[PDB]
Structures are given as C-alpha cells and as structure tokens.
Design a protein around this ligand. Sequence first.
Ligand SMILES: Nc1ccn([C@H]2O[C@H](CO)[C@@H](OP(=O)(O)O)[C@@H]2O)c(=O)n1
Ligand SMILES: Nc1ccn([C@H]2O[C@H](CO)[C@@H](OP(=O)(O)O)[C@@H]2O)c(=O)n1
Lengths: 124, 124
Amino acid sequence: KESAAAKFERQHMDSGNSPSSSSNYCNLMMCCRKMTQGKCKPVNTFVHESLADVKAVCSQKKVTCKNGQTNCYQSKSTMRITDCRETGSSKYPNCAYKTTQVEKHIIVACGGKPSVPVHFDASV
Amino acid sequence: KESAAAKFERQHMDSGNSPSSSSNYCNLMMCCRKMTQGKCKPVNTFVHESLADVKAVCSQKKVTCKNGQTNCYQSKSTMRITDCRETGSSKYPNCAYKTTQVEKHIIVACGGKPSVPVHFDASV
Ligand SMILES: Nc1ccn([C@H]2O[C@H](CO)[C@@H](OP(=O)(O)O)[C@@H]2O)c(=O)n1
Ligand SMILES: Nc1ccn([C@H]2O[C@H](CO)[C@@H](OP(=O)(O)O)[C@@H]2O)c(=O)n1
C-alpha cells in the first residue's frame, strides 16, 4: 500500500518542473495517458487536430505501412502534432521525453467498421 | 478489453489549439498524478519548492488543521505553488481545471517517523 509520505509526494510535489514550461508536455501527457507504466514507451505522437479530422484520414491517401500491412493512410494535409521521444537520460521509472511541436502529415493504420485509426504509423 | 479505437484515442489524441499551454498544467498533472480516476478531485495544490523545504515545514509554525487534527504546520515563508481547481464546466470523466500560480504559505499535516508531510491542509 502506498505510504502517506509517498501519497503526499504524488499529490502535492512538483519540485523538478516549471508549471510555465512548454517542453514538459510529453512528460506529463505520456504519464497521463498511461504510457509510462511498466516501461517508458520510447516514441509516441499526439495529434491536436479534431477527432473528426483524424478519423477522416482513413478515407484519404492509401500508403505503405512501415510494417508492410496494407491498411495505412496518409493525411492529405499536415496536422498539428507533438512528437514525444525518450531522452538519453530517461530511465524507468523516471521517464523523460523531448517534446517537439511539429506540423507533418500523419500516417495511421485503420481498422474496424467504421474504419477508424487503430495505430499511429509515422509522421512524414 | 480496451478497444483498438479507444486505445488510439488514449495514446494519440489530444485535440486542441494550445496543448502545451501553461493553462493546461493542472489538466495534465491531475491526470498524471492519478487524481482524476473515479471522480475529479475538486481542489489540489502542487508545490514547486525542494522537498527539503517542504519537509522542513514539519519543524516550523504549529497550526491546527482545518479538520481539527493537531499535527499541522505552517511554512515560515511563502512557497511557489500551483493551485488546481475544477472549472464550472468540468464534468467527469472530462475533468477540467483552472491553473493558478501563486506564492503562499502552505499548511501541511506531518506524520510518521521521521515526521514528514502526509496531507496538504491549506494554502494561506
Ligand atoms: N512518429 C511516431 C512513430 C511511431 N510511433 C509508434 O511507436 C510505436 C512503435 O512503432 C507505436 O506504438 P505501439 O506499436 O506500442 O502502439 C507508435 O504508434 C508514434 O507514436 N509516433
Ligand atoms: N489549497 C488546497 C486546499 C485543499 N487541498 C486539499 O483538498 C482535499 C481536501 O481538503 C485534500 O485532498 P485529500 O484529502 O483527498 O488528500 C487536498 O490536500 C489542496 O490540495 N489545496
């Protein structure tokens, strides 16, 4: 069971960060979205366009998947995204990320009915 | 089991114009630090000072806790803190917070051996 001391640190301590930082985004979001549990996910992209716009990519340009499947689609336009990459100093359970604001085309794998994004393949 | 569609949304979607804005700090932090599971915690303070300074409060000014417990202590000096409070529009599971950076004295309950902060009581 989590100690009261540890609970206080979790709920109330942020000694290592500035709340006015723009570059702490990946650190917080990777944590929030449960990609720092068990291991640090090394690479992850967050997309800031509307869910409708991202879903629409499944009806856009068919392209090669990095994994050779035939269900990938590239956005017709660039999208506002954030690239999160694990830093060289990052070591689980202290997962540290470089945040990069980018505007690139996204490539997603689509699946299901309706066909919706199920995997983020690449930004190009 | 989490659907592939939902997994993509969790991992890759953060729709909005200013995702890295300091105004979003509480939204991100409250999520990361596990205070938005089950319900939105309505009020929470993060402290940006060294843990040494926060621990030192346990040897500072004795004050009664808001709840009538008698193990609270007020910081002798102000501390840089971030006040997180639910907005009028916040509704679980979509928790939304107003982020306010302030400098205030903190009041914490101290417990255990060694006696360390175990609860955040108030800021004044
Ligand atoms: N720009 C990129 C490139 C790859 N990735 C991917 O990095 C991981 C491996 O390729 C993928 O996660 P999962 O495969 O764990 O879902 C994720 O889709 C990403 O999120 N952004
Ligand atoms: N300024 C304030 C006032 C209260 N709080 C507190 O709001 C809650 C109840 O007062 C406390 O959480 P828990 O009691 O759930 O740990 C938390 O310490 C805070 O974090 N900041």
